[PDB]
mmCIF file of N, CA and C in Angstrom:
data_model
loop_
_atom_site.group_PDB
_atom_site.id
_atom_site.type_symbol
_atom_site.label_atom_id
_atom_site.label_comp_id
_atom_site.label_asym_id
_atom_site.label_seq_id
_atom_site.Cartn_x
_atom_site.Cartn_y
_atom_site.Cartn_z
ATOM 1 N N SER I 251 0.881 -1.204 0.026
ATOM 2 C CA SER I 251 0.017 -0.049 0.064
ATOM 3 C C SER I 251 0.931 1.196 -0.058
ATOM 4 N N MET I 252 0.269 2.370 -0.397
ATOM 5 C CA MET I 252 1.021 3.588 -0.320
ATOM 6 C C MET I 252 1.182 4.001 1.169
ATOM 7 N N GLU I 253 0.277 3.693 2.010
ATOM 8 C CA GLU I 253 0.521 3.967 3.518
ATOM 9 C C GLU I 253 1.850 3.285 4.006
ATOM 10 N N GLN I 254 1.943 1.985 3.758
ATOM 11 C CA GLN I 254 3.037 1.121 4.254
ATOM 12 C C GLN I 254 4.300 1.744 3.758
ATOM 13 N N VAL I 255 4.370 2.198 2.430
ATOM 14 C CA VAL I 255 5.494 2.915 1.903
ATOM 15 C C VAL I 255 5.866 4.117 2.573
ATOM 16 N N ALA I 256 4.864 4.955 2.890
ATOM 17 C CA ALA I 256 4.992 6.224 3.530
ATOM 18 C C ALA I 256 5.548 6.061 4.969
ATOM 19 N N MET I 257 5.054 4.954 5.595
ATOM 20 C CA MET I 257 5.576 4.649 6.971
ATOM 21 C C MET I 257 7.022 4.208 6.935
ATOM 22 N N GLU I 258 7.299 3.267 6.007
ATOM 23 C CA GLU I 258 8.616 2.850 5.777
ATOM 24 C C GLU I 258 9.665 4.055 5.454
ATOM 25 N N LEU I 259 9.175 5.158 4.712
ATOM 26 C CA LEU I 259 10.076 6.277 4.500
ATOM 27 C C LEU I 259 10.224 7.039 5.795
ATOM 28 N N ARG I 260 9.176 7.101 6.678
ATOM 29 C CA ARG I 260 9.328 7.742 8.051
ATOM 30 C C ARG I 260 10.450 6.989 8.867
ATOM 31 N N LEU I 261 10.377 5.738 8.820
ATOM 32 C CA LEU I 261 11.310 4.889 9.609
ATOM 33 C C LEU I 261 12.795 5.094 9.106
ATOM 34 N N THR I 262 12.796 5.148 7.732
ATOM 35 C CA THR I 262 14.171 5.284 7.082
ATOM 36 C C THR I 262 14.764 6.722 7.447
ATOM 37 N N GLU I 263 13.831 7.664 7.520
ATOM 38 C CA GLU I 263 14.344 9.051 7.890
ATOM 39 C C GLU I 263 14.747 9.011 9.502
ATOM 40 N N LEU I 264 13.991 8.369 10.199
ATOM 41 C CA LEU I 264 14.281 8.369 11.697
ATOM 42 C C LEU I 264 15.606 7.539 11.817
ATOM 43 N N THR I 265 15.892 6.560 10.976
ATOM 44 C CA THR I 265 17.093 5.806 11.093
ATOM 45 C C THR I 265 18.253 6.668 10.765
ATOM 46 N N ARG I 266 18.009 7.480 9.727
ATOM 47 C CA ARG I 266 19.025 8.449 9.314
ATOM 48 C C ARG I 266 19.382 9.409 10.460
ATOM 49 N N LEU I 267 18.367 9.963 11.222
ATOM 50 C CA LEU I 267 18.579 10.924 12.209
ATOM 51 C C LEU I 267 19.293 10.197 13.460
ATOM 52 N N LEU I 268 18.782 8.978 13.814
ATOM 53 C CA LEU I 268 19.459 8.215 14.891
ATOM 54 C C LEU I 268 20.901 7.795 14.583
ATOM 55 N N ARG I 269 21.267 7.521 13.335
ATOM 56 C CA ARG I 269 22.539 7.266 13.001
ATOM 57 C C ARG I 269 23.424 8.367 13.176
ATOM 58 N N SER I 270 22.993 9.697 13.017
ATOM 59 C CA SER I 270 23.823 10.808 13.336
ATOM 60 C C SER I 270 23.884 11.037 14.851
ATOM 61 N N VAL I 271 22.762 10.837 15.547
ATOM 62 C CA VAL I 271 22.750 10.846 17.000
ATOM 63 C C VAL I 271 23.771 9.912 17.541
ATOM 64 N N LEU I 272 23.806 8.723 17.017
ATOM 65 C CA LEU I 272 24.643 7.682 17.553
ATOM 66 C C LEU I 272 26.146 8.039 17.362
ATOM 67 N N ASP I 273 26.435 8.660 16.174
ATOM 68 C CA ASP I 273 27.810 9.122 15.929
ATOM 69 C C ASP I 273 28.184 10.267 16.822
ATOM 70 N N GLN I 274 27.377 11.041 17.131
ATOM 71 C CA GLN I 274 27.613 12.156 18.047
ATOM 72 C C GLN I 274 27.863 11.665 19.475
ATOM 73 N N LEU I 275 27.108 10.724 19.818
ATOM 74 C CA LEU I 275 27.198 10.110 21.179
ATOM 75 C C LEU I 275 28.553 9.324 21.344
ATOM 76 N N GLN I 276 28.834 8.593 20.391
ATOM 77 C CA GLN I 276 30.084 7.854 20.463
ATOM 78 C C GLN I 276 31.297 8.657 20.437
ATOM 79 N N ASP I 277 31.272 9.799 19.875
ATOM 80 C CA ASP I 277 32.396 10.766 19.851
ATOM 81 C C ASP I 277 32.609 11.271 21.316
ATOM 82 N N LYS I 278 31.653 11.155 22.159
ATOM 83 C CA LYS I 278 31.819 11.542 23.509
ATOM 84 C C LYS I 278 32.420 10.470 24.365
ATOM 85 N N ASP I 279 32.786 9.240 23.712
ATOM 86 C CA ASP I 279 33.471 8.202 24.321
ATOM 87 C C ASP I 279 34.849 7.981 23.521
ATOM 88 N N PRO I 280 35.744 8.918 23.716
ATOM 89 C CA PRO I 280 36.986 8.825 22.846
ATOM 90 C C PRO I 280 37.896 7.661 23.088
ATOM 91 N N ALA I 281 37.818 7.265 24.413
ATOM 92 C CA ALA I 281 38.674 6.061 24.857
ATOM 93 C C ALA I 281 38.040 4.718 24.410
ATOM 94 N N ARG I 282 36.786 4.756 23.780
ATOM 95 C CA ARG I 282 36.173 3.453 23.246
ATOM 96 C C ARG I 282 35.734 2.435 24.225
ATOM 97 N N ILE I 283 35.557 2.972 25.527
ATOM 98 C CA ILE I 283 35.166 2.105 26.634
ATOM 99 C C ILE I 283 33.831 1.385 26.332
ATOM 100 N N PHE I 284 32.980 2.019 25.607
ATOM 101 C CA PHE I 284 31.614 1.494 25.348
ATOM 102 C C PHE I 284 31.429 1.069 23.962
ATOM 103 N N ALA I 285 32.453 0.918 23.142
ATOM 104 C CA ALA I 285 32.335 0.607 21.762
ATOM 105 C C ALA I 285 31.790 -0.842 21.469
ATOM 106 N N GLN I 286 32.281 -1.907 22.350
ATOM 107 C CA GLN I 286 31.959 -3.161 22.000
ATOM 108 C C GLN I 286 31.288 -3.785 23.341
ATOM 109 N N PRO I 287 30.691 -5.052 23.244
ATOM 110 C CA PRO I 287 30.229 -5.638 24.434
ATOM 111 C C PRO I 287 31.316 -6.019 25.279
ATOM 112 N N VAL I 288 30.965 -6.045 26.589
ATOM 113 C CA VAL I 288 31.919 -6.501 27.556
ATOM 114 C C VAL I 288 32.200 -8.027 27.257
ATOM 115 N N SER I 289 33.476 -8.388 27.140
ATOM 116 C CA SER I 289 33.738 -9.724 26.778
ATOM 117 C C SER I 289 33.493 -10.807 27.884
ATOM 118 N N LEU I 290 32.776 -11.853 27.565
ATOM 119 C CA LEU I 290 32.514 -12.906 28.557
ATOM 120 C C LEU I 290 33.714 -13.755 28.683
ATOM 121 N N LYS I 291 34.666 -13.809 27.801
ATOM 122 C CA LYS I 291 35.976 -14.440 27.990
ATOM 123 C C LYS I 291 36.707 -13.763 29.079
ATOM 124 N N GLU I 292 36.693 -12.479 28.935
ATOM 125 C CA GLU I 292 37.552 -11.724 30.009
ATOM 126 C C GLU I 292 36.799 -11.302 31.366
ATOM 127 N N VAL I 293 35.531 -11.251 31.269
ATOM 128 C CA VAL I 293 34.632 -11.027 32.473
ATOM 129 C C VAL I 293 33.695 -12.122 32.448
ATOM 130 N N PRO I 294 34.081 -13.397 32.913
ATOM 131 C CA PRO I 294 33.228 -14.460 32.797
ATOM 132 C C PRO I 294 31.981 -14.382 33.611
ATOM 133 N N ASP I 295 31.966 -13.768 34.724
ATOM 134 C CA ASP I 295 30.863 -13.613 35.638
ATOM 135 C C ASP I 295 29.922 -12.371 35.342
ATOM 136 N N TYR I 296 30.102 -11.682 34.113
ATOM 137 C CA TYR I 296 29.473 -10.415 33.853
ATOM 138 C C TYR I 296 27.889 -10.598 33.928
ATOM 139 N N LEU I 297 27.471 -11.567 33.454
ATOM 140 C CA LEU I 297 25.901 -11.769 33.360
ATOM 141 C C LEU I 297 25.315 -12.057 34.596
ATOM 142 N N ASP I 298 26.056 -12.374 35.572
ATOM 143 C CA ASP I 298 25.583 -12.666 36.975
ATOM 144 C C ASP I 298 25.292 -11.242 37.598
ATOM 145 N N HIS I 299 25.994 -10.220 37.022
ATOM 146 C CA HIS I 299 25.865 -8.831 37.604
ATOM 147 C C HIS I 299 24.947 -8.009 36.753
ATOM 148 N N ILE I 300 25.033 -8.104 35.431
ATOM 149 C CA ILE I 300 24.291 -7.257 34.547
ATOM 150 C C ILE I 300 23.432 -8.101 33.779
ATOM 151 N N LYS I 301 22.093 -7.841 33.893
ATOM 152 C CA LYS I 301 21.194 -8.681 33.099
ATOM 153 C C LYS I 301 20.788 -8.365 31.576
ATOM 154 N N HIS I 302 21.031 -6.994 31.288
ATOM 155 C CA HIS I 302 20.688 -6.464 29.950
ATOM 156 C C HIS I 302 21.972 -5.806 29.534
ATOM 157 N N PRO I 303 23.061 -6.500 29.050
ATOM 158 C CA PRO I 303 24.235 -5.857 28.537
ATOM 159 C C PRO I 303 23.880 -4.986 27.348
ATOM 160 N N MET I 304 24.684 -3.829 27.186
ATOM 161 C CA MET I 304 24.580 -3.074 25.902
ATOM 162 C C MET I 304 25.840 -2.348 25.665
ATOM 163 N N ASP I 305 25.996 -2.011 24.382
ATOM 164 C CA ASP I 305 27.193 -1.284 23.873
ATOM 165 C C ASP I 305 26.924 -0.620 22.598
ATOM 166 N N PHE I 306 27.789 0.158 22.005
ATOM 167 C CA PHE I 306 27.564 0.993 20.862
ATOM 168 C C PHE I 306 27.514 0.062 19.610
ATOM 169 N N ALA I 307 28.321 -0.905 19.550
ATOM 170 C CA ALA I 307 28.259 -1.827 18.298
ATOM 171 C C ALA I 307 26.888 -2.609 18.232
ATOM 172 N N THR I 308 26.295 -2.914 19.346
ATOM 173 C CA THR I 308 25.088 -3.672 19.476
ATOM 174 C C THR I 308 23.933 -2.671 19.038
ATOM 175 N N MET I 309 24.041 -1.376 19.551
ATOM 176 C CA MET I 309 23.056 -0.459 19.072
ATOM 177 C C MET I 309 23.133 -0.139 17.534
ATOM 178 N N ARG I 310 24.338 -0.064 17.007
ATOM 179 C CA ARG I 310 24.458 0.069 15.614
ATOM 180 C C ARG I 310 23.904 -1.111 14.786
ATOM 181 N N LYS I 311 23.996 -2.331 15.185
ATOM 182 C CA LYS I 311 23.311 -3.416 14.482
ATOM 183 C C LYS I 311 21.906 -3.283 14.486
ATOM 184 N N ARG I 312 21.359 -2.868 15.632
ATOM 185 C CA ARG I 312 19.881 -2.752 15.772
ATOM 186 C C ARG I 312 19.426 -1.593 14.894
ATOM 187 N N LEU I 313 20.233 -0.468 14.923
ATOM 188 C CA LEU I 313 19.836 0.600 14.083
ATOM 189 C C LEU I 313 19.808 0.339 12.593
ATOM 190 N N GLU I 314 20.843 -0.329 12.043
ATOM 191 C CA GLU I 314 20.894 -0.727 10.595
ATOM 192 C C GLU I 314 19.843 -1.656 10.142
ATOM 193 N N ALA I 315 19.372 -2.427 11.099
ATOM 194 C CA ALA I 315 18.180 -3.257 10.901
ATOM 195 C C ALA I 315 16.844 -2.445 10.984
ATOM 196 N N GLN I 316 16.882 -1.179 11.059
ATOM 197 C CA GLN I 316 15.732 -0.206 11.395
ATOM 198 C C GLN I 316 14.928 -0.764 12.458
ATOM 199 N N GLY I 317 15.689 -1.251 13.498
ATOM 200 C CA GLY I 317 15.089 -1.876 14.790
ATOM 201 C C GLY I 317 14.722 -0.865 15.770
ATOM 202 N N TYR I 318 15.021 0.450 15.679
ATOM 203 C CA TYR I 318 14.438 1.471 16.542
ATOM 204 C C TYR I 318 13.177 2.172 15.921
ATOM 205 N N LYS I 319 12.052 2.042 16.693
ATOM 206 C CA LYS I 319 10.814 2.645 16.108
ATOM 207 C C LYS I 319 10.619 4.044 16.509
ATOM 208 N N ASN I 320 11.293 4.393 17.577
ATOM 209 C CA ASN I 320 11.105 5.824 17.997
ATOM 210 C C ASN I 320 12.476 6.198 18.791
ATOM 211 N N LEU I 321 12.656 7.421 19.150
ATOM 212 C CA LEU I 321 13.774 7.803 19.899
ATOM 213 C C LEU I 321 13.643 7.282 21.435
ATOM 214 N N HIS I 322 12.619 7.089 21.881
ATOM 215 C CA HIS I 322 12.562 6.538 23.282
ATOM 216 C C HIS I 322 13.322 5.233 23.343
ATOM 217 N N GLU I 323 13.071 4.343 22.389
ATOM 218 C CA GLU I 323 13.703 3.098 22.392
ATOM 219 C C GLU I 323 15.260 3.064 22.344
ATOM 220 N N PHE I 324 15.710 3.977 21.499
ATOM 221 C CA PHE I 324 17.184 4.356 21.230
ATOM 222 C C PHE I 324 17.714 4.812 22.546
ATOM 223 N N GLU I 325 17.091 5.799 23.110
ATOM 224 C CA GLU I 325 17.540 6.301 24.421
ATOM 225 C C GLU I 325 17.542 5.271 25.423
ATOM 226 N N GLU I 326 16.599 4.273 25.487
ATOM 227 C CA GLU I 326 16.651 3.227 26.497
ATOM 228 C C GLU I 326 18.077 2.475 26.383
ATOM 229 N N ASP I 327 18.291 2.107 25.181
ATOM 230 C CA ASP I 327 19.620 1.465 24.991
ATOM 231 C C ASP I 327 20.837 2.263 25.377
ATOM 232 N N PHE I 328 20.768 3.533 25.145
ATOM 233 C CA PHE I 328 21.894 4.337 25.582
ATOM 234 C C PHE I 328 22.006 4.474 27.115
ATOM 235 N N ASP I 329 20.895 4.698 27.637
ATOM 236 C CA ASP I 329 21.022 4.683 29.128
ATOM 237 C C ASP I 329 21.381 3.309 29.677
ATOM 238 N N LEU I 330 21.039 2.225 29.028
ATOM 239 C CA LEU I 330 21.660 0.800 29.547
ATOM 240 C C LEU I 330 23.153 0.929 29.683
ATOM 241 N N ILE I 331 23.764 1.333 28.557
ATOM 242 C CA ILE I 331 25.277 1.458 28.525
ATOM 243 C C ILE I 331 25.852 2.148 29.784
ATOM 244 N N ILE I 332 25.345 3.306 30.087
ATOM 245 C CA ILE I 332 25.643 4.143 31.139
ATOM 246 C C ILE I 332 25.337 3.449 32.489
ATOM 247 N N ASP I 333 24.130 3.029 32.645
ATOM 248 C CA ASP I 333 23.618 2.633 33.974
ATOM 249 C C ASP I 333 24.316 1.157 34.302
ATOM 250 N N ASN I 334 24.615 0.380 33.355
ATOM 251 C CA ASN I 334 25.311 -0.969 33.583
ATOM 252 C C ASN I 334 26.623 -0.650 34.101
ATOM 253 N N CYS I 335 27.295 0.297 33.474
ATOM 254 C CA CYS I 335 28.659 0.654 33.793
ATOM 255 C C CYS I 335 28.801 1.172 35.195
ATOM 256 N N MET I 336 27.916 2.048 35.595
ATOM 257 C CA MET I 336 27.914 2.606 36.834
ATOM 258 C C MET I 336 27.504 1.710 37.994
ATOM 259 N N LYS I 337 26.949 0.693 37.682
ATOM 260 C CA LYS I 337 26.602 -0.543 38.640
ATOM 261 C C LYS I 337 27.865 -1.466 38.783
ATOM 262 N N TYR I 338 28.292 -1.950 37.668
ATOM 263 C CA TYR I 338 29.381 -2.921 37.621
ATOM 264 C C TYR I 338 30.704 -2.430 38.226
ATOM 265 N N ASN I 339 31.090 -1.102 37.821
ATOM 266 C CA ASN I 339 32.298 -0.510 38.186
ATOM 267 C C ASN I 339 32.030 0.380 39.404
ATOM 268 N N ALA I 340 33.141 0.478 40.299
ATOM 269 C CA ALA I 340 33.060 1.415 41.359
ATOM 270 C C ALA I 340 33.285 2.851 40.923
ATOM 271 N N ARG I 341 32.888 3.727 41.746
ATOM 272 C CA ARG I 341 33.091 5.238 41.549
ATOM 273 C C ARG I 341 34.327 5.674 41.299
ATOM 274 N N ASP I 342 35.451 5.125 41.836
ATOM 275 C CA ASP I 342 36.867 5.452 41.688
ATOM 276 C C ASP I 342 37.484 4.634 40.461
ATOM 277 N N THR I 343 36.875 4.564 39.326
ATOM 278 C CA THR I 343 37.417 3.847 38.264
ATOM 279 C C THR I 343 37.441 4.573 36.956
ATOM 280 N N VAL I 344 38.355 4.259 36.013
ATOM 281 C CA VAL I 344 38.203 5.040 34.857
ATOM 282 C C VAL I 344 36.858 4.726 34.075
ATOM 283 N N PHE I 345 36.405 3.553 34.178
ATOM 284 C CA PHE I 345 35.154 3.194 33.581
ATOM 285 C C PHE I 345 33.993 3.929 34.007
ATOM 286 N N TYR I 346 33.766 3.979 35.312
ATOM 287 C CA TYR I 346 32.668 4.772 35.941
ATOM 288 C C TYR I 346 32.702 6.167 35.481
ATOM 289 N N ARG I 347 33.912 6.822 35.623
ATOM 290 C CA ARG I 347 34.146 8.137 35.271
ATOM 291 C C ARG I 347 33.782 8.465 33.753
ATOM 292 N N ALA I 348 34.136 7.465 32.943
ATOM 293 C CA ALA I 348 33.844 7.684 31.485
ATOM 294 C C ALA I 348 32.377 7.595 31.279
ATOM 295 N N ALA I 349 31.679 6.712 32.058
ATOM 296 C CA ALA I 349 30.265 6.817 31.875
ATOM 297 C C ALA I 349 29.538 8.077 32.381
ATOM 298 N N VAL I 350 30.135 8.742 33.485
ATOM 299 C CA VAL I 350 29.533 10.005 33.879
ATOM 300 C C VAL I 350 29.625 11.020 32.766
ATOM 301 N N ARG I 351 30.816 11.058 32.160
ATOM 302 C CA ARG I 351 31.133 12.165 31.128
ATOM 303 C C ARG I 351 30.334 11.837 29.867
ATOM 304 N N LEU I 352 30.137 10.618 29.592
ATOM 305 C CA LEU I 352 29.171 10.298 28.422
ATOM 306 C C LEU I 352 27.790 10.643 28.671
ATOM 307 N N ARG I 353 27.246 10.437 29.870
ATOM 308 C CA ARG I 353 25.937 10.762 30.327
ATOM 309 C C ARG I 353 25.774 12.326 30.170
ATOM 310 N N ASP I 354 26.710 13.027 30.794
ATOM 311 C CA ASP I 354 26.594 14.565 30.922
ATOM 312 C C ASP I 354 26.650 15.152 29.510
ATOM 313 N N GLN I 355 27.615 14.698 28.648
ATOM 314 C CA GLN I 355 27.801 15.273 27.375
ATOM 315 C C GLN I 355 26.831 14.798 26.331
ATOM 316 N N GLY I 356 26.242 13.602 26.525
ATOM 317 C CA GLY I 356 25.182 13.057 25.625
ATOM 318 C C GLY I 356 23.919 13.764 25.822
ATOM 319 N N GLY I 357 23.677 14.184 27.043
ATOM 320 C CA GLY I 357 22.311 14.830 27.499
ATOM 321 C C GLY I 357 22.001 16.080 26.534
ATOM 322 N N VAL I 358 22.987 16.804 26.150
ATOM 323 C CA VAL I 358 22.902 17.930 25.256
ATOM 324 C C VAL I 358 22.456 17.476 23.881
ATOM 325 N N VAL I 359 23.047 16.302 23.392
ATOM 326 C CA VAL I 359 22.778 15.894 22.068
ATOM 327 C C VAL I 359 21.472 15.307 21.945
ATOM 328 N N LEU I 360 21.012 14.566 23.047
ATOM 329 C CA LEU I 360 19.681 14.023 23.121
ATOM 330 C C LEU I 360 18.519 15.061 23.317
ATOM 331 N N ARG I 361 18.845 16.144 24.115
ATOM 332 C CA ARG I 361 17.874 17.165 24.271
ATOM 333 C C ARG I 361 17.494 17.799 22.900
ATOM 334 N N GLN I 362 18.388 17.976 21.896
ATOM 335 C CA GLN I 362 18.045 18.541 20.675
ATOM 336 C C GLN I 362 17.365 17.359 19.740
ATOM 337 N N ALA I 363 17.871 16.282 19.686
ATOM 338 C CA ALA I 363 17.214 15.127 18.952
ATOM 339 C C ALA I 363 15.809 14.945 19.423
ATOM 340 N N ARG I 364 15.454 15.239 20.489
ATOM 341 C CA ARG I 364 14.096 15.050 20.932
ATOM 342 C C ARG I 364 13.218 16.140 20.379
ATOM 343 N N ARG I 365 13.718 17.296 20.282
ATOM 344 C CA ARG I 365 13.114 18.324 19.495
ATOM 345 C C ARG I 365 12.899 18.151 18.001
ATOM 346 N N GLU I 366 14.000 17.644 17.340
ATOM 347 C CA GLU I 366 14.085 17.171 15.884
ATOM 348 C C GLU I 366 13.153 16.120 15.544
ATOM 349 N N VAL I 367 12.851 15.147 16.439
ATOM 350 C CA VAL I 367 11.981 14.030 16.265
ATOM 351 C C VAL I 367 10.495 14.471 16.393
ATOM 352 N N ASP I 368 10.207 15.260 17.480
ATOM 353 C CA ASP I 368 8.905 15.981 17.609
ATOM 354 C C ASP I 368 8.623 16.927 16.408
ATOM 355 N N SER I 369 9.573 17.801 15.995
ATOM 356 C CA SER I 369 9.459 18.746 15.071
ATOM 357 C C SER I 369 9.207 18.042 13.647
ATOM 358 N N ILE I 370 10.128 17.244 13.170
ATOM 359 C CA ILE I 370 10.024 16.629 11.899
ATOM 360 C C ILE I 370 9.065 15.310 11.868
ATOM 361 N N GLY I 371 8.377 15.078 13.032
ATOM 362 C CA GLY I 371 7.276 14.109 13.078
ATOM 363 C C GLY I 371 7.813 12.698 12.945
#
């Protein structure tokens, strides 16, 4: 139908906007602490601690499958990255501190993405 096409075009354009959001958020992680999943070879007990692991590569796979239907879902995944890190790692660690900086700096990028998603519909 023409409606299904039009909806597909909306999802395509959301995917384009989220792709730019993801690139901007990941630049706020220059040390690449959140680039890939925590390794279960190197942290074999991770899943006893963290029930819903997340990282930027895993978000990128979901994005390119047009697997985010709205910005809320995308933000949920970003928030997991930060919140998982801040639980698993102690306050006095480079990991925790990197998460706090990512959260603070990403907030700005997400504040405007929310306006761009509401605005462009």
